[PDB]
Amino acid sequence: DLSAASHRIPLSDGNSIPIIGLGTYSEPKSTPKGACATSVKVAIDTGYRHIDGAYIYQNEHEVGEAIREKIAEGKVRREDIFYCGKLWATNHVPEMVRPTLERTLRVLQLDYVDLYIIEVPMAFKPGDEIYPRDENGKWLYHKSNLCATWEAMEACKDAGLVKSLGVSNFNRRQLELILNKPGLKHKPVSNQVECHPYFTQPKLLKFCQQHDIVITAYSPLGTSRNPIWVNVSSPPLLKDALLNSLGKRYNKTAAQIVLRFNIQRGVVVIPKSFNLERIKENFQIFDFSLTEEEMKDIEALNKNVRFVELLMWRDHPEYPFHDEY
Numbered sequence: 001d002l003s004a005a006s007h008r009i010p011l012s013d014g015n016s017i018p019i020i021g022l023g024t025y026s027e028p029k030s031t032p033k034g035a036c037a038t039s040v041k042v043a044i045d046t047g048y049r050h051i052d053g054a055y056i057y058q059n060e061h062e063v064g065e066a067i068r069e070k071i072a073e074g075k076v077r078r079e080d081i082f083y084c085g086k087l088w089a090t091n092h093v094p095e096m097v098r099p100t101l102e103r104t105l106r107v108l109q110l111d112y113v114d115l116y117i118i119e120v121p122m123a124f125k126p127g128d129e130i131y132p133r134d135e136n137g138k139w140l141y142h143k144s145n146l147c148a149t150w151e152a153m154e155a156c157k158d159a160g161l162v163k164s165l166g167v168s169n170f171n172r173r174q175l176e177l178i179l180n181k182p183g184l185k186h187k188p189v190s191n192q193v194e195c196h197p198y199f200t201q202p203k204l205l206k207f208c209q210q211h212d213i214v215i216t217a218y219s220p221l222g223t224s225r226n227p228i229w230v231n232v233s234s235p236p237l238l239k240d241a242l243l244n245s246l247g248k249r250y251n252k253t254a255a256q257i258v259l260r261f262n263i264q265r266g267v268v269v270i271p272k273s274f275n276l277e278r279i280k281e282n283f284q285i286f287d288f289s290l291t292e293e294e295m296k297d298i299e300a301l302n303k304n305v306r307f308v309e310l311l312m313w314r315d316h317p318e319y320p321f322h323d324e325y
């Protein structure tokens with residue numbers, strides 16, 4: 001079935017997506033310049049054909065540098081690489097969608113992106129700051145209009161600037177808003193949300209499957225555990241007893257077990273690593289498989305507790321995690 005050489009799964013719009021990709025979020029403060037570029041190149045050399053990034057990660061130019069270098073040397077052709085970009089909360093105004101995508105295309109120095117998604121369903125005040133706030137720290141929220149923003153996204157696909165359209169951090173309600181939109185042209189093909197053994201997303205996954213929407217698991221390894229977005233009080237995913245015991249069984253690390261778990265269930269995983277050894281380690285998940293019993297025991301680790309709660313925005317009209325799923 002899935003192999004290092006061939007592991008692309010179908011998207012509802014006729015395109016396909018590599019089941020594993022390299023995540024590229026890294027704290028700008030503690031990340032050396034060029035680390036992303038080096039990592040993307042190593043990832044491609046290793047076998048990765050999917051790179052997940054975002055303009056707001058401040059390293060999209062490094063992602064493009066790496067992809068273009070690998071294409072220039074003949075390591076891969078543009079069609080062999082799948083890049084996902086994202087539209088941040090401060091660029092949801094309809095008239096801003098295309099210009100925002102065009103910026104990313106210029107930053108990457110590519111003609112199109114394979115997948116472009118609404119980064120979060122919440123809309124923030126447009127400007128030169130991703131986190132709009134006043135002297136009181138009070139978050140400057142903007143009226144969201146998902147359907148209108150989606151229509152703008154649709155025009156980008158119509159123009160050929162992006163192959164597939166998707167969303168991120170969208171709950172059932174929000175997905176239905178688009179799925180039931182009058183005159184819907186392009187249905188979302190992917191929903192990128194936190195997903196791993198401690199938060200298996202059973203209900204959202206089933207809902208998405210009913211609409212041929214593929215889930216992409218962000219923070220598939222349980223996050224970098226940065227106190228800014230994660231509670232360091234929670235037990236680390238990679239230290240889980242079962243995950244480590246199963247690792248011993250297959251002589252694989254807990255990270256490899258968790259990644260195999262999700263891809264075996266049809267969930268795309270985009271683990272991030274800027275470390276040579278770990279980039280390679282995370283890709284070695286096609287030489288073994290988990291038994292039905294092991295898959296069930298791993299899914300049973302689900303705590304229905306997420307690592308990324310985005311609690312600072314729980315007051316936004318579009319908060320995604322207030323509802324069950």
Ligand SMILES: NC(=O)c1ccc[n+]([C@@H]2O[C@H](COP(=O)([O-])OP(=O)(O)OC[C@H]3O[C@@H](n4cnc5c(N)ncnc54)[C@H](OP(=O)(O)O)[C@@H]3O)[C@@H](O)[C@H]2O)c1
Binds near residue numbers: 225255
């Ligand atoms: N759309 C959204 O809202 C959203 C939110 C968060 C993330 N994402 C995307 O999802 C990608 C993945 O998530 P994430 O970066 O939060 O988390 P992650 O992939 O779950 O975990 C990354 C952390 O794990 C370490 N790591 C990587 N491989 C490892 C291995 N084999 N063993 C032990 N530790 C390992 C990394 O350090 P080293 O680099 O030193 O290996 C890093 O600290 C992002 O980079 C981004 O592209 C999207």
